[PDB]
Amino acid sequence: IDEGLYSRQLYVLGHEAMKRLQTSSVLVSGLRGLGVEIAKNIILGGVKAVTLHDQGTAQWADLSSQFYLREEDIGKNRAEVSQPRLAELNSYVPVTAYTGPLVEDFLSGFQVVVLTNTPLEDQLRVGEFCHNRGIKLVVADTRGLFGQLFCDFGEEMILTDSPLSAMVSMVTKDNPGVVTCLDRHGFESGDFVSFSEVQGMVELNGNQPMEIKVLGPYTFSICDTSNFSDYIRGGIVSQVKVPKKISFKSLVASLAEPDFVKFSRPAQLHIGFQALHQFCAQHGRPPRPRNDEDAAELVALAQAVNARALPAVQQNNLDEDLIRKLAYVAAGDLAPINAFIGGLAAQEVMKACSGKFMPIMQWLYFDALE
Amino acid sequence: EGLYSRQLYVLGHEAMKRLQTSSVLVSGLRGLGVEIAKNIILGGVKAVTLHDQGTAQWADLSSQFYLREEDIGKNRAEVSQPRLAELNSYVPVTAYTGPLVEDFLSGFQVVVLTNTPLEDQLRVGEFCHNRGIKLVVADTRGLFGQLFCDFGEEMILTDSQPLSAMVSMVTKDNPGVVTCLDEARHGFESGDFVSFSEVQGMVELNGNQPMEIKVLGPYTFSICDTSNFSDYIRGGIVSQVKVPKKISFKSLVASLAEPDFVVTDFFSRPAQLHIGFQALHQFCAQHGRPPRPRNDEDAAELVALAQAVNARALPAVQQNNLDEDLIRKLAYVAAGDLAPINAFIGGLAAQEVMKACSGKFMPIMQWLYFDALEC
C-alpha cells in the first residue's frame, strides 16, 4: 500500500498490527527449547498458521529449557504436548501438531520451514527440497554457549538496501500524488524516497520514506496526498532505499561455500559445528564435559573437516582451543541462549513471511561468553 | 574444582541443583519483562520477585504471552505470577505491586528494570549502586533495543603473546601442584586460569579445560586435582589463558552522561540512539504517551528534543551533525512492541542477570544498543 510507509511496513512485518492479511504458513520442526521459543515468538507475531513437527518424545534432558513440558509429559510426543499450550497464545493463529515424517509433499504445503534439533543429513535433505520447490528455510541451533543460524530464502529475494536526487518542480494532491521535476529517473518502482524543503504541503518533509512508481523520466508516483495541504514550488527529493534480487545458495551448497555475517571467528565454528554433527551421529550423544577424550575426538573431526574444506572456509591453522571449548560445552541446554537465538530465528521467520527485508546471509555464528 | 568451561555452563543455569545465592527483582511485567523473568526462572536463580504497579493493557497482550483478554485491568505482576511459578519448582516466584522503596529494594542482590520511567531508573540506580546491588536496565522501542549493566565498582572478571612457562614437576595429588622455574613464573597469580600442552606422563593435563591456579611459593602453584592422573614424567608448557581484573562500573546516573558502548568493546549509531532514547523519555514524560506512528509532527518534536539532548551531551556522546533520520525513525517506531525483539533482547538481558548472580564473566560494559537490521 502507498499509504504504508517504510518505517510503518517495518512494523507490520515484525508482527505489529497483527490483524492484517497473513499469507505464509510455517512448519516449526523440533520442539525442544529452541523450537518452542521460536514457535512461541512466531505465534505472538501472528503468522498465518503454524504446524509443530516432532517425532521425538519428551525426555528429562528436555525439561530444563522447554517451558511447556513438565514431569507429567516425559514419554509423550513433544509437539503434541506443546501444541495445546501454544494454541492458547492467541485466538487467530491456528497451531497444529504433526508427528509424521517430513515427506516432500507434506513440506510442500508450506511457505516457510524452520529446522531445530535436526540431524545434519536431514537438514541437507529437507533443505535441497525446500530450495527446489521454493520453500524458505530457517535452520537454528544451540550447543551450550554457542549458536548457529542459517537462512536460504531461495535463489530469489527482492531486498531493500542503502542516493541520486532530483529537484521538486511540482507534486499534486491526488490519490496517488504525482511528483514532477525538470531534467530524476532510475527511480523506477519499489524505490523508497524522502523529501525536504517542500513548501505548501510541509507534511511531506519529515515523513517516512515512501514507495515510488515511475511513470516517466520527469515523473514518479508517491504516496497518497489527497488529505494534505496544497503545494508550492520549493523542495528536494532523495532516494533512501532501492530493491535488489539477492540469490541464496541451498543449504547443501552454502554448507560448502558459506557467506558469513557478533562472534570473532565464524568459519571455525562452522567447521566445529560440522564436526559436532559427525560426533553426535557416531556416538548418539554430544561430547560430555569433564571429558578430555570426547574433546580430543572432536578436534580430530574438526581437523579432518578442515582438511576436506574448500579453500574459502579452510583455515591454515584451526583454533583447537575453540573446538575443545565447543566439545566441553556441547551438552548444555540453556534457556537464556535458546531465548536469545530463538529471538533472532523468529525475526528470520518474519522476514521470510512477508516484507522482503534483508535476511541473514545464510550463516550466523554466536558465542555467548566470548 | 569445576574446570573453566564447566564454570561457564554453571553460570548459564546448566545445573540448577547446586546452591543459589542471589535473589532477583524483575520490575515491569510487559512482554520484555516476562521474557527475562521466564528465562531467569528456567535458569534457576535463587528467587525471583516480580514487580509491576501497572494493569494489563490492550497493547501489552501481543507480547507478554501469559496475559490474555480476560486479564485486561488485572495487575501485570499478579496475573503473570502463577504461570511463571510453574516453570521451576526449585525457584520461589512472588509478586509485589507496591512502590520501589529502599526497604523493598535492599533485600535483592540483582534488580532488573523494564518499563520504568527514566527519573525512576536514576533514583533506583543511585540506590543500587550505593548498596552494591547489581542493576540491569532493558528496553524495547519497536525495532530498537537498549541494554544497560551496572555491576558495581566491585566487579571482578577474567579476560584474555600469552604468558608461557615450562613445567618442572606436577604432583599427583588433590590438588595437584606444579613446580616452575621460568622467569615468566612471576606473571602467574592466584586465580589466573591456566592450560597445558606437551606434558609427558600426566597426559590428561594436555586435554583439559583451563583450570584455576593457586600460588604457593616462588616456584609452585596448585592446579585441579590430579590424584587419578598418570604419573608426571617430564616436560610440558603451562600457558596463561584467563586473568582476573577488577573493573569499576559507573552508576546509571554517571553512565547516562559518559557511556561506554558495546559491539565496540568485545561508533556513532549507539551514541545517537542513546540520545534518541533520552529524547524519547522526555517526550513520553511530557505527552504521557510515545510518538504516534503516522505523525510527522511527533517525529519532528523528538528531533528537537534530541537536538537539545545532544547540545547538553558530553564528547563521548555529542555529535557535530545529528542523524535526524535515525531520530525520526525512532519516533515513527516507538509504539511497537514486537515479540521476536523482546524475546531476543530478553534473552540477552537474562544472560546478564545470570552473570551478575554468579559471574566472574564480562557483562555488558555500560550500554548495548541494537537495531533490528543485520550486515
XYZ file of C-alpha atoms in Angstrom:
745
model
C 0.000 0.000 0.000
C 1.151 3.517 -0.872
C -0.131 4.799 2.465
C 2.021 2.246 4.270
C 5.394 3.941 4.605
C 8.872 2.397 5.094
C 9.156 2.525 8.907
C 5.469 1.628 9.183
C 5.876 -1.531 6.986
C 8.933 -2.496 9.078
C 6.483 -2.846 11.986
C 3.642 -4.541 10.271
C 6.178 -7.164 9.119
C 7.670 -7.518 12.601
C 4.219 -8.607 13.871
C 2.785 -5.174 14.695
C -0.795 -4.666 13.519
C -1.333 -8.421 13.746
C -4.838 -8.370 12.264
C -3.568 -7.931 8.706
C -3.621 -10.375 5.814
C -1.159 -13.089 6.800
C -0.083 -15.186 3.833
C 2.668 -17.540 4.938
C 2.235 -20.806 6.806
C 5.157 -22.106 8.816
C 6.465 -25.524 9.788
C 8.481 -25.410 13.010
C 10.342 -28.694 13.379
C 11.871 -29.866 16.643
C 10.120 -28.942 19.867
C 12.908 -28.821 22.442
C 13.741 -25.457 23.993
C 14.897 -23.784 20.782
C 11.836 -24.629 18.693
C 9.241 -23.790 21.362
C 10.909 -20.406 21.788
C 10.712 -19.930 18.022
C 7.140 -21.151 17.760
C 6.017 -19.011 20.711
C 7.549 -15.847 19.168
C 6.125 -16.673 15.777
C 2.567 -17.214 17.043
C 2.650 -13.994 19.078
C 3.887 -12.483 15.887
C 0.723 -13.618 14.142
C 1.828 -15.556 11.048
C -0.990 -17.177 9.053
C -0.738 -20.640 10.600
C 1.875 -22.772 12.377
C 2.442 -26.511 12.405
C 4.681 -28.103 15.028
C 6.544 -31.188 13.885
C 8.238 -33.693 16.155
C 8.720 -37.451 16.185
C 10.630 -37.461 19.478
C 9.148 -37.875 22.938
C 9.743 -35.598 25.896
C 12.878 -36.582 27.841
C 14.376 -35.451 31.161
C 17.141 -33.643 29.224
C 14.388 -31.623 27.503
C 12.594 -30.425 30.650
C 15.091 -27.792 31.721
C 14.606 -25.473 28.759
C 11.151 -26.309 27.433
C 8.665 -24.075 29.283
C 5.606 -26.154 28.211
C 6.866 -29.567 29.227
C 6.526 -30.998 32.750
C 7.281 -34.189 34.658
C 3.838 -35.485 33.610
C 4.854 -35.341 29.918
C 8.052 -37.449 29.753
C 7.425 -40.104 27.134
C 4.638 -38.178 25.331
C 5.301 -36.557 21.917
C 6.924 -33.135 22.203
C 4.777 -31.481 19.506
C 1.529 -32.938 20.799
C 2.223 -31.761 24.342
C 3.363 -28.265 23.321
C 0.504 -27.661 20.883
C -2.399 -27.096 23.356
C -0.444 -24.572 25.417
C 0.945 -22.855 22.296
C -2.546 -22.731 20.731
C -3.743 -20.596 23.661
C -1.236 -17.819 22.921
C -3.723 -16.171 20.558
C -7.124 -16.955 19.028
C -6.237 -16.005 15.433
C -3.194 -18.198 14.691
C -4.091 -21.878 14.199
C -1.476 -24.166 15.738
C -1.363 -27.801 14.735
C 0.881 -30.753 15.587
C 2.276 -33.268 13.143
C 4.186 -36.325 14.327
C 4.921 -37.816 10.909
C 7.891 -37.826 8.529
C 8.951 -34.667 6.691
C 7.950 -36.212 3.418
C 8.278 -33.982 0.342
C 4.571 -33.467 -0.379
C 3.950 -32.672 3.277
C 6.668 -29.957 3.355
C 5.277 -28.695 0.046
C 2.232 -27.272 1.804
C 4.392 -24.560 3.417
C 5.944 -21.203 2.596
C 8.433 -21.348 5.473
C 10.178 -24.244 7.216
C 12.134 -23.935 10.479
C 14.513 -26.767 11.366
C 15.600 -27.267 15.010
C 17.093 -30.346 16.716
C 17.579 -31.929 13.266
C 20.445 -34.238 12.205
C 22.704 -32.817 9.535
C 21.698 -35.287 6.825
C 18.013 -34.486 7.315
C 18.837 -30.790 7.145
C 20.572 -31.351 3.787
C 17.669 -33.487 2.546
C 14.905 -31.152 3.648
C 16.977 -28.196 2.542
C 17.618 -29.319 -1.008
C 13.920 -29.999 -1.371
C 12.861 -26.648 0.107
C 15.267 -24.793 -2.089
C 13.973 -26.649 -5.151
C 10.270 -26.131 -4.578
C 10.758 -22.555 -3.390
C 10.135 -23.051 0.328
C 12.055 -20.640 2.565
C 14.337 -22.344 5.098
C 15.469 -21.263 8.549
C 17.868 -23.593 10.414
C 18.636 -22.796 14.059
C 20.800 -24.485 16.650
C 22.203 -24.070 20.152
C 25.141 -26.019 21.555
C 25.693 -24.816 25.080
C 27.125 -21.308 24.859
C 27.234 -21.411 21.048
C 24.563 -20.737 18.476
C 24.097 -21.204 14.786
C 21.648 -19.633 12.367
C 21.115 -20.436 8.711
C 18.797 -18.953 6.048
C 18.022 -19.918 2.471
C 15.207 -17.664 1.248
C 15.660 -19.210 -2.179
C 17.728 -18.029 -5.145
C 15.286 -15.120 -5.373
C 14.516 -12.447 -2.785
C 13.947 -8.762 -3.590
C 15.875 -6.878 -0.877
C 15.787 -3.194 0.076
C 19.201 -1.542 0.621
C 21.182 1.649 1.385
C 21.264 8.228 -3.471
C 20.516 10.206 -6.630
C 18.360 13.258 -6.018
C 16.024 15.449 -8.054
C 14.524 18.909 -7.573
C 10.778 19.067 -6.927
C 9.125 21.295 -9.501
C 5.610 20.097 -8.518
C 3.557 17.485 -6.625
C -0.233 17.054 -6.852
C -2.856 16.471 -4.148
C -4.055 13.301 -5.884
C -4.529 9.637 -4.890
C -1.797 8.800 -5.642
C 0.037 12.126 -5.552
C 2.181 12.639 -8.630
C 5.581 14.356 -8.379
C 7.215 16.271 -11.237
C 10.563 17.989 -11.951
C 12.906 19.394 -14.625
C 15.792 17.419 -16.143
C 15.002 12.111 -11.594
C 14.867 8.756 -13.358
C 16.240 5.359 -12.366
C 13.780 5.660 -9.502
C 11.696 3.023 -11.301
C 9.286 1.301 -8.957
C 9.685 -0.070 -5.438
C 12.158 2.676 -4.542
C 11.682 4.448 -1.231
C 12.073 8.201 -1.207
C 12.379 11.170 1.215
C 11.572 14.894 0.963
C 12.861 18.181 2.387
C 12.126 21.914 1.872
C 8.710 21.248 0.278
C 6.722 24.483 0.630
C 2.941 24.261 0.865
C 2.486 20.607 1.839
C 5.074 20.735 4.620
C 3.865 17.288 5.709
C 5.982 15.620 3.028
C 9.202 16.904 4.572
C 9.694 14.948 7.781
C 7.874 11.843 6.578
C 8.796 8.185 6.440
C 10.372 7.009 3.165
C 7.573 6.299 0.614
C 7.320 3.675 -2.110
C 7.614 5.056 -5.646
C 6.063 4.182 -9.027
C 7.824 5.819 -12.002
C 5.644 6.883 -14.935
C 8.422 8.565 -16.930
C 11.761 10.421 -16.762
C 10.286 13.523 -15.117
C 7.521 11.946 -13.039
C 7.056 9.253 -10.393
C 4.081 8.355 -8.200
C 4.370 8.863 -4.437
C 2.089 8.073 -1.501
C -1.481 9.358 -1.489
C -1.673 13.105 -0.855
C -5.404 13.894 -1.158
C -5.775 14.818 2.519
C -2.714 17.086 2.636
C -2.212 20.829 2.246
C -1.644 22.405 -1.200
C 1.813 22.566 -2.816
C 4.188 25.455 -3.576
C 7.447 25.311 -5.613
C 10.364 24.639 -3.233
C 11.568 21.155 -2.367
C 14.157 18.448 -2.993
C 13.713 14.671 -3.241
C 16.187 11.913 -2.403
C 16.459 8.155 -2.768
C 16.570 6.298 0.561
C 16.327 2.627 -0.412
C 16.363 0.525 -3.580
C 15.458 -3.143 -4.214
C 17.901 -5.855 -5.370
C 17.389 -9.512 -6.174
C 19.598 -11.445 -3.770
C 20.372 -15.057 -4.664
C 20.552 -17.643 -1.866
C 22.541 -20.881 -2.010
C 20.761 -24.060 -0.961
C 21.880 -25.414 2.449
C 23.881 -28.182 0.761
C 25.761 -25.569 -1.282
C 26.121 -22.912 1.417
C 27.482 -25.517 3.775
C 30.487 -25.834 1.467
C 30.654 -22.181 0.344
C 29.293 -20.207 3.310
C 28.703 -16.486 3.422
C 29.062 -15.268 6.983
C 27.586 -12.315 8.834
C 28.952 -10.867 16.569
C 31.452 -13.737 17.155
C 35.093 -13.184 16.136
C 35.706 -16.477 14.283
C 32.686 -17.987 12.472
C 34.481 -20.189 9.897
C 35.911 -22.159 12.798
C 32.540 -22.515 14.489
C 31.268 -23.549 11.066
C 33.913 -26.293 10.937
C 33.342 -27.020 14.615
C 29.583 -27.427 14.106
C 30.081 -29.808 11.192
C 32.395 -31.972 13.296
C 29.869 -31.845 16.127
C 27.188 -33.407 13.900
C 29.654 -36.013 12.834
C 30.348 -36.744 16.519
C 26.694 -36.962 17.515
C 25.925 -39.125 14.522
C 28.702 -41.522 15.586
C 28.152 -41.686 19.314
C 24.463 -40.926 19.643
C 25.214 -38.209 22.219
C 27.151 -34.939 22.206
C 30.545 -34.666 23.964
C 30.380 -34.850 27.751
C 32.098 -32.025 29.627
C 34.755 -33.171 32.089
C 35.810 -35.483 29.298
C 39.111 -34.569 27.626
C 38.699 -37.653 25.387
C 35.491 -36.571 23.588
C 37.081 -33.183 23.148
C 40.119 -34.785 21.532
C 37.830 -36.752 19.241
C 36.063 -33.519 18.256
C 39.424 -31.928 17.459
C 40.316 -34.895 15.206
C 36.951 -34.476 13.478
C 37.418 -30.723 13.135
C 40.899 -31.189 11.634
C 39.579 -33.605 9.064
C 36.604 -31.308 8.329
C 39.145 -28.510 7.852
C 41.352 -30.692 5.610
C 38.409 -31.503 3.332
C 37.002 -27.945 3.227
C 37.210 -25.692 0.161
C 39.963 -23.020 0.180
C 37.488 -20.312 1.284
C 36.459 -21.851 4.627
C 39.667 -23.808 5.103
C 41.911 -22.464 7.852
C 45.708 -22.621 7.776
C 45.653 -23.161 11.493
C 42.446 -24.210 13.123
C 41.760 -22.966 16.653
C 41.896 -26.264 18.546
C 41.234 -24.306 21.717
C 37.924 -23.088 20.366
C 36.988 -26.609 19.161
C 37.702 -28.071 22.593
C 35.568 -25.385 24.209
C 32.777 -26.485 21.850
C 33.100 -30.097 22.914
C 33.146 -29.389 26.644
C 30.238 -27.036 26.270
C 28.064 -29.086 23.903
C 25.948 -30.925 26.490
C 24.354 -27.641 27.581
C 20.800 -26.555 27.010
C 20.495 -23.041 28.415
C 17.300 -21.036 28.500
C 18.865 -17.584 28.019
C 20.798 -18.727 24.933
C 17.770 -20.517 23.439
C 15.631 -17.469 24.083
C 18.220 -15.193 22.511
C 18.828 -17.263 19.345
C 15.107 -18.095 19.284
C 14.564 -14.359 19.103
C 16.816 -13.938 16.080
C 15.412 -17.017 14.403
C 11.844 -15.671 14.730
C 12.745 -12.384 13.036
C 14.158 -14.539 10.277
C 10.851 -16.340 10.001
C 9.012 -12.998 9.997
C 11.254 -11.716 7.204
C 10.628 -14.917 5.212
C 6.865 -14.497 5.831
C 6.463 -11.075 4.204
C 8.194 -7.787 3.576
C 11.395 -8.832 1.923
C 13.856 -7.040 4.207
C 17.472 -8.167 4.350
C 17.825 -11.713 5.695
C 20.897 -13.111 7.405
C 23.266 -14.105 4.628
C 22.894 -17.819 5.185
C 25.284 -18.233 8.130
C 25.490 -16.516 11.515
C 27.555 -17.829 14.433
C 27.408 -16.699 18.036
C 29.440 -17.025 21.234
C 27.604 -16.085 24.435
C 30.575 -15.878 26.818
C 33.416 -14.891 24.438
C 37.069 -27.949 41.232
C 34.888 -27.229 38.214
C 37.201 -26.582 35.297
C 36.653 -23.221 33.467
C 34.170 -24.076 30.716
C 32.124 -26.196 33.133
C 32.015 -22.986 35.219
C 30.548 -21.038 32.272
C 27.820 -23.686 31.991
C 27.007 -23.437 35.706
C 26.589 -19.665 35.451
C 24.335 -20.337 32.479
C 21.935 -22.397 34.571
C 23.143 -25.734 33.215
C 22.757 -27.219 36.688
C 20.024 -25.713 38.866
C 20.549 -28.242 41.648
C 23.673 -26.615 43.064
C 23.368 -23.790 45.600
C 21.998 -20.378 44.581
C 22.921 -17.158 46.328
C 21.318 -14.204 44.543
C 17.660 -13.137 44.636
C 16.407 -11.032 41.727
C 13.818 -8.286 41.218
C 12.297 -8.049 37.735
C 10.234 -4.872 37.568
C 7.804 -4.279 34.726
C 5.776 -7.290 33.586
C 5.216 -6.276 29.975
C 6.473 -8.685 27.335
C 10.151 -7.818 27.695
C 9.949 -8.272 31.476
C 8.066 -11.577 31.411
C 10.606 -12.836 28.887
C 13.531 -12.036 31.129
C 11.683 -13.498 34.102
C 10.851 -16.729 32.350
C 14.476 -17.110 31.223
C 15.842 -16.375 34.695
C 13.492 -18.856 36.323
C 14.310 -21.674 33.869
C 17.846 -20.589 34.654
C 17.389 -21.397 38.280
C 18.354 -18.317 40.244
C 17.688 -18.444 43.976
C 14.493 -16.408 43.909
C 12.538 -14.133 41.654
C 10.256 -11.296 42.722
C 8.010 -9.765 40.037
C 7.200 -6.080 40.355
C 4.576 -4.181 38.441
C 2.345 -1.382 39.616
C 0.544 -1.244 36.265
C -2.513 -3.001 34.875
C -2.607 -5.229 31.812
C -3.395 -3.041 28.785
C -4.574 -3.834 25.282
C -1.145 -3.115 23.816
C 0.535 -5.418 26.354
C -1.147 -8.535 25.038
C 0.715 -9.302 21.784
C 3.923 -9.791 23.754
C 3.627 -10.939 27.353
C 2.325 -14.368 26.365
C 0.804 -15.139 29.766
C -1.630 -12.199 29.504
C -4.923 -12.661 27.613
C -8.030 -10.566 27.029
C -9.662 -11.797 30.216
C -6.681 -10.326 32.155
C -7.160 -6.703 30.973
C -7.235 -4.480 34.053
C -5.738 -7.059 36.403
C -2.228 -6.170 37.703
C 0.518 -7.374 35.362
C 2.756 -8.847 38.037
C -0.024 -10.765 39.798
C -1.506 -12.212 36.572
C 1.941 -13.240 35.358
C 2.945 -14.912 38.640
C 1.159 -18.316 38.892
C 2.221 -19.257 35.370
C 5.792 -18.106 35.938
C 5.713 -20.127 39.172
C 5.049 -23.360 37.281
C 8.296 -23.132 35.283
C 10.640 -24.367 38.025
C 9.724 -25.919 41.363
C 13.143 -25.014 42.783
C 12.580 -21.244 42.225
C 10.176 -19.275 44.504
C 8.223 -16.680 42.491
C 6.130 -13.952 44.090
C 4.528 -10.675 43.049
C 4.884 -7.229 44.592
C 2.659 -4.350 43.494
C 3.888 -1.589 45.764
C 6.391 1.191 45.005
C 10.159 0.649 44.783
C 11.120 1.826 48.282
C 14.548 1.346 49.864
C 13.316 -1.342 52.275
C 11.897 -3.399 49.435
C 14.971 -2.963 47.226
C 17.561 -3.680 49.935
C 16.880 -7.428 50.088
C 17.900 -8.024 46.450
C 21.311 -8.941 45.020
C 20.173 -8.167 41.478
C 17.487 -5.742 40.257
C 16.147 -5.723 36.660
C 14.268 -2.701 35.303
C 11.912 -2.878 32.318
C 9.077 -0.424 31.594
C 10.472 2.137 34.064
C 10.355 5.923 33.535
C 13.791 7.475 33.396
C 13.517 9.533 36.583
C 12.667 6.324 38.436
C 15.530 4.480 36.731
C 18.006 7.053 38.054
C 16.634 7.169 41.599
C 16.662 3.367 41.803
C 20.128 3.174 40.225
C 21.662 5.656 42.629
C 20.334 3.406 45.390
C 21.513 0.079 43.966
C 24.965 1.484 43.290
C 25.287 2.705 46.885
C 24.221 -0.666 48.281
C 26.188 -2.790 45.805
C 23.004 -4.255 44.317
C 23.731 -5.109 40.685
C 21.495 -3.306 38.150
C 20.301 -4.263 34.647
C 18.139 -1.886 32.549
C 16.461 -3.314 29.469
C 14.255 -1.625 26.895
C 12.485 -2.047 23.558
C 11.163 0.725 21.328
C 9.772 -1.135 18.343
C 12.799 -2.356 16.340
C 15.321 -0.684 18.654
C 16.667 -2.360 21.775
C 18.595 -0.870 24.706
C 20.652 -2.748 27.288
C 22.490 -1.420 30.365
C 24.524 -3.009 33.147
C 25.940 -1.694 36.435
C 27.611 -4.495 38.380
C 29.255 -2.137 40.835
C 32.821 -0.920 41.209
C 33.172 -4.273 42.945
C 33.152 -6.313 39.777
C 35.891 -8.854 39.136
C 36.152 -10.783 35.910
C 38.504 -12.924 33.898
C 39.896 -11.940 30.475
C 42.495 -12.658 27.773
C 51.528 -13.348 23.046
C 50.023 -15.216 26.040
C 52.382 -15.713 29.032
C 54.044 -19.119 28.931
C 56.328 -21.139 31.175
C 57.985 -24.531 31.289
C 56.941 -27.162 33.775
C 59.480 -28.852 36.027
C 57.082 -31.028 38.007
C 53.460 -31.875 38.558
C 52.481 -33.775 41.690
C 49.769 -36.376 41.573
C 47.578 -35.185 44.410
C 44.409 -33.373 45.473
C 45.054 -30.680 44.465
C 47.994 -31.340 42.159
C 50.922 -28.931 42.485
C 53.108 -27.580 39.669
C 56.812 -26.674 40.000
C 58.023 -23.944 37.613
C 61.492 -22.319 37.304
C 60.872 -19.921 34.394
C 61.417 -16.195 34.910
C 57.949 -15.951 33.377
C 56.663 -17.705 36.538
C 56.344 -14.283 38.146
C 53.449 -13.216 35.941
C 51.175 -16.028 37.126
C 48.903 -15.051 40.051
C 46.301 -16.916 42.130
C 43.049 -17.013 40.205
C 44.682 -16.966 36.781
C 43.215 -19.648 34.550
C 45.804 -21.889 33.048
C 46.194 -24.673 30.454
C 48.834 -27.212 29.342
C 50.393 -28.777 26.289
C 53.383 -31.104 25.787
C 53.087 -32.733 29.230
C 54.554 -36.249 29.437
C 53.247 -38.979 31.703
C 50.382 -36.960 33.116
C 48.882 -36.620 29.641
C 45.366 -35.874 30.957
C 46.619 -32.320 31.594
C 47.024 -31.500 27.881
C 43.402 -32.078 27.003
C 41.761 -30.243 29.889
C 39.627 -27.096 30.243
C 41.616 -24.163 31.689
C 41.946 -24.659 35.459
C 42.202 -22.075 38.230
C 45.626 -21.556 39.794
C 46.518 -21.046 43.449
C 50.118 -19.888 44.032
C 52.008 -21.412 46.987
C 55.508 -20.012 46.616
C 58.018 -18.589 44.116
C 58.351 -21.935 42.327
C 54.963 -23.616 42.826
C 51.220 -23.323 42.371
C 48.196 -25.600 42.774
C 46.002 -26.785 39.907
C 42.989 -29.099 39.674
C 43.142 -32.444 41.459
C 45.373 -34.891 39.580
C 45.016 -37.737 42.082
C 43.722 -40.022 39.346
C 46.037 -38.938 36.593
C 49.073 -40.776 35.267
C 52.491 -40.116 36.846
C 54.123 -36.984 35.519
C 57.353 -37.850 33.731
C 58.873 -34.705 32.158
C 58.320 -31.623 30.023
C 55.213 -29.550 29.420
C 54.154 -25.941 28.972
C 51.829 -24.030 31.224
C 50.100 -21.145 29.437
C 48.022 -18.352 30.917
C 44.530 -18.352 29.384
C 42.405 -16.053 31.533
C 43.417 -13.334 34.046
C 41.231 -11.753 36.777
C 40.691 -7.974 36.713
C 38.683 -5.596 38.914
C 36.583 -3.292 36.808
C 34.618 -0.356 38.175
C 31.192 0.321 36.716
C 29.764 3.839 36.707
C 26.319 4.092 38.318
C 23.449 4.717 35.872
C 23.352 8.450 36.545
C 27.033 8.930 35.665
C 26.905 6.312 32.932
C 23.992 8.084 31.188
C 26.335 11.062 30.829
C 29.575 9.213 29.941
C 28.505 5.924 28.291
C 30.857 3.141 27.284
C 29.206 1.223 24.421
C 29.489 -2.440 23.379
C 29.922 -4.201 19.994
C 32.648 -1.590 20.315
C 34.015 -3.264 23.477
C 34.120 -7.029 22.784
C 30.548 4.099 16.784
C 28.136 6.977 16.181
C 24.919 4.943 15.880
C 24.720 3.925 19.561
C 25.629 7.409 20.779
C 22.810 8.677 18.539
C 20.360 6.078 19.794
C 21.431 6.923 23.359
C 20.386 10.482 22.657
C 17.183 9.368 20.940
C 16.234 7.179 23.879
C 16.895 10.073 26.245
C 14.805 12.289 23.953
C 12.140 9.622 23.854
C 11.979 9.516 27.642
C 11.468 13.283 27.786
C 8.800 13.120 25.051
C 6.894 10.432 26.963
C 7.144 12.195 30.310
C 5.723 15.312 28.656
C 2.946 13.895 26.484
C 2.190 10.890 28.693
C 2.412 8.810 25.504
C 5.034 7.899 22.874
C 5.171 9.449 19.378
C 2.208 8.358 17.216
C 3.298 6.145 14.257
C 1.905 8.177 11.338
C 2.535 11.574 12.898
C 5.368 13.633 11.388
C 4.807 16.380 13.978
C 5.545 13.954 16.793
C 8.628 12.812 14.900
C 9.808 16.371 14.352
C 9.364 17.152 18.041
C 11.504 14.200 19.065
C 14.165 15.567 16.728
C 14.013 18.896 18.560
C 14.129 17.168 21.975
C 17.046 15.089 20.724
C 18.897 18.001 19.213
C 18.723 19.615 22.662
C 19.918 16.477 24.444
C 22.801 16.496 22.007
C 23.716 20.063 22.871
C 23.913 19.218 26.576
C 25.794 15.966 25.784
C 29.464 15.296 26.614
C 32.101 14.459 23.928
C 31.618 10.717 24.480
C 28.093 11.205 23.120
C 27.658 14.564 21.395
C 27.593 14.661 17.594
C 28.544 17.576 15.329
C 25.790 16.504 12.938
C 22.853 14.621 14.493
C 21.344 11.916 12.250
C 17.740 13.139 12.282
C 16.739 10.244 10.050
C 17.556 7.960 12.956
C 15.556 10.130 15.367
C 12.588 10.462 13.029
C 12.714 6.697 12.552
C 12.792 6.116 16.320
C 9.698 8.316 16.695
C 7.793 6.547 13.908
C 8.942 3.439 15.644
C 8.291 3.934 19.382
C 4.735 2.451 19.576
C 5.916 -1.025 18.541
C 6.028 -3.965 20.952
C 7.396 -6.847 18.883
C 7.597 -10.435 20.187
C 10.776 -11.528 18.356
C 12.593 -8.377 19.531
C 11.537 -8.606 23.176
C 12.447 -12.298 23.092
C 15.916 -11.733 21.725
C 16.613 -8.665 23.947
C 15.029 -10.643 26.793
C 17.495 -13.450 26.160
C 20.464 -11.103 26.338
C 19.294 -9.280 29.456
C 18.736 -12.637 31.126
C 22.306 -13.698 30.362
C 23.412 -10.517 32.112
C 21.328 -11.292 35.179
C 22.975 -14.698 35.228
C 26.455 -13.163 35.091
C 25.521 -10.816 37.917
C 24.314 -13.632 40.182
C 27.355 -15.888 39.766
C 29.548 -14.204 37.166
C 33.289 -13.616 37.071
C 32.454 -13.076 33.399
C 32.309 -9.930 31.299
C 28.946 -8.221 31.463
C 27.867 -5.590 29.005
C 30.298 -2.778 29.618
C 27.814 0.023 30.054
C 25.309 0.230 27.174
C 24.444 -2.113 24.293
C 22.217 -0.504 21.660
C 20.529 -2.611 18.998
C 18.564 -2.142 15.780
C 16.679 -4.952 14.065
C 18.906 -4.947 10.994
C 21.917 -7.093 10.104
C 25.069 -6.942 7.958
